[PDB]
Amino acid sequence: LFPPQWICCDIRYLDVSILGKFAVVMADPPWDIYGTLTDDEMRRLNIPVLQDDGFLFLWVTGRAMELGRECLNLWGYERVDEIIWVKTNQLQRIIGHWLNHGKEHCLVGVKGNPQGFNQGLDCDVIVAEVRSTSHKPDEIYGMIERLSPGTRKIELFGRPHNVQPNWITLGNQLDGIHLLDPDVVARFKQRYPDGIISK
Amino acid sequence: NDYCQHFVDTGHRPQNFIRDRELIRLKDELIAKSNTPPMYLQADIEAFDIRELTPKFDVILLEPPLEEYYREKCWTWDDIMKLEIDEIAAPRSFIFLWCGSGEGLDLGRVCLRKWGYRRCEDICWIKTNKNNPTLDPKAVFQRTKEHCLMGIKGTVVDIDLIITEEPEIGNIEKPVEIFHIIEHFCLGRRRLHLFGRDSTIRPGWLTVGPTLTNSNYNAETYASYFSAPNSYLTGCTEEIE
Numbered sequence: 460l461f462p463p464q465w466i467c468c469d470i471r472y473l474d475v476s477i478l479g480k481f482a483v484v485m486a487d488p489p490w491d492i493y494g495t496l497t498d499d500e501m502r503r504l505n506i507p508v509l510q511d512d513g514f515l516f517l518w519v520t521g522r523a524m525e526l527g528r529e530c531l532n533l534w535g536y537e538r539v540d541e542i543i544w545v546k547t548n549q550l551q552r553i554i555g556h557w558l559n560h561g562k563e564h565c566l567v568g569v570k571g572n573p574q575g576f577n578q579g580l581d582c583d584v585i586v587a588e589v590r591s592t593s594h595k596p597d598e599i600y601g602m603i604e605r606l607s608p609g610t611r612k613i614e615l616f617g618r619p620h621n622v623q624p625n626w627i628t629l630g631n632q633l634d635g636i637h638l639l640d641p642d643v644v645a646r647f648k649q650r651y652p653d654g655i656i657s658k
Numbered sequence: 659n660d661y662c663q664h665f666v667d668t669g670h671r672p673q674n675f676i677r678d679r680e681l682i683r684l685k686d687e688l689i690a691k692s693n694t695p696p697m698y699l700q701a702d703i704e705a706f707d708i709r710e711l712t713p714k715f716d717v718i719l720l721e722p723p724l725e726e727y728y729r730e731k732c733w734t735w736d737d738i739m740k741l742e743i744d745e746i747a748a749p750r751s752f753i754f755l756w757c758g759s760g761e762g763l764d765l766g767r768v769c770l771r772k773w774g775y776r777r778c779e780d781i782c783w784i785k786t787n788k789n790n791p792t793l794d795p796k797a798v799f800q801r802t803k804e805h806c807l808m809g810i811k812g813t814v815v816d817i818d819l820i821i822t823e824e825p826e827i828g829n830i831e832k833p834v835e836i837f838h839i840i841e842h843f844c845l846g847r848r849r850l851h852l853f854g855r856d857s858t859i860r861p862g863w864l865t866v867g868p869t870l871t872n873s874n875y876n877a878e879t880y881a882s883y884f885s886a887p888n889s890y891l892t893g894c895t896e897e898i899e
């Protein structure tokens with residue numbers, strides 16, 4: 460279980476019920492503001508099966524600030540926090556047509572009643588350097604791990620550099636399938652005997 | 659490197675380590691030269707018929723006193739949502755709504771849509787704690803910022819960040835820098851600040867709030883500042899001779 464795991468797939472079509480339940484879900488969707496997903500495709504994502512009790516981290520920008528709130532609620536979450544990442548250069552200087560944008564937003568949703576999470580350890584501002592285009596700061600994984608140490612986590616629309624211990628990463632630019640958790644391996648084989656993920 | 663870990667280790671917020679042409683001052687001078695006299699009216703906004711404020715405004719800054727501001731009479735989002743802000747907004751106009759850090763980030767967006775605006779910017783007031791390295795039950799993280807949402811209605815420089823030190827307990831003032839950002843947009847000269855205070859009164863603004871100690875507002879005098887030939891100035895151009 461513990462080492463990084465991933466599935467190259469089209470998240471619209473993967474049967475995510477084979478993955479089990481997660482303490483934390485993070486998504487960095489290609490909002491329709493690379494290839495994108497339509498608003499309806501985002502709404503229809505089977506996020507509700509991924510968790511019983513825990514937190515969702517949902518990166519948003521532009522009009523997805525609103526559309527992401529719609530999806531969050533549709534999927535069964537209440538938005539209880541909002542992280543902002545202040546983007547700096549290597550010298551800690553800060554790097555929408557009315558104002559220049561110094562930050563990215565990450566909505567934080569809760570589902571059910573999570574118990575045993577370390578709420579309040581971190582604050583809701585990240586100061587970190589822009590790495591490359593569309594690369595989120597690695598600090599978010601540390602905040603999430605301190606909030607929920609040792610638990611199962613899943614990232615949607617991640618790239619190879621996003622794979623992390625305790626996480627399963629889904630995205631269509633990953634290299635193949637790499638699954639180590641025996642429960643997931645078993646359910647994947649049953650559901651996908653020939654290893655193909657289509658409709 | 660990892661300022662989040664550092665905050666966990668030391669209590670210094672990550673924004674404490676953010677660090678840090680020459681023409682954005684003739685603009686400031688033009689703004690200053692075009693500003694109307696400061697005007698202000700003490701009014702219990704809940705009991706006040708908002709329609710007595712005329713004419714319709716180009717910019718509305720709305721700063722309702724939320725309960726979360728008094729951690730250690732407040733307005734609920736129920737109260738705020740029931741304001742008839744669309745009745746005093748010009749068909750082309752802007753709003754800046756201080757929403758706090760909790761449920762107002764959602765309910766303030768409901769308000770903007772109810773009043774007929776679309777959100778076009780999300781301005782974050784990030785509070786440092788350099789001088790001093792309690793959670794809402796629903797909070798997952800320590801809340802160290804407030805949001806001021808900018809909304810636009812009708813058809814159609816700075817950064818969306820204000821960084822200052824967290825005020826002392828009991829201080830509800832928002833950073834005056836919000837006025838600079840607003841005025842730098844050059845949106846027109848009829849500017850309303852609802853729930854302002856004696857301390858926020860400012861040239862170029864009509865300030866309306868329950869705690870003001872004095873009033874000088876006269877609707878006819880105020881309207882006279884914008885009568886022809888000055889009906890459509892941006893607030894950033896020279897006065898008409």
Ligand SMILES: CNc1cc(N2CCC[C@@](O)(CNC(=O)c3ccc(CN4CCC(C)(C)CC4)cc3)C2)ncn1
Nearest residue numbers: 468469470487489493494518593594595616630631632
């Ligand atoms: C069609 N169905 C799919 C699509 C799919 N994608 C579609 C191709 C790209 C994909 O491979 C990897 N994601 C990205 O590159 C990507 C690009 C931009 C953003 C926006 N964000 C950037 C990071 C931020 C924190 C700065 C804030 C803003 C997020 C992710 C996933 N994955 C599975 N199924």
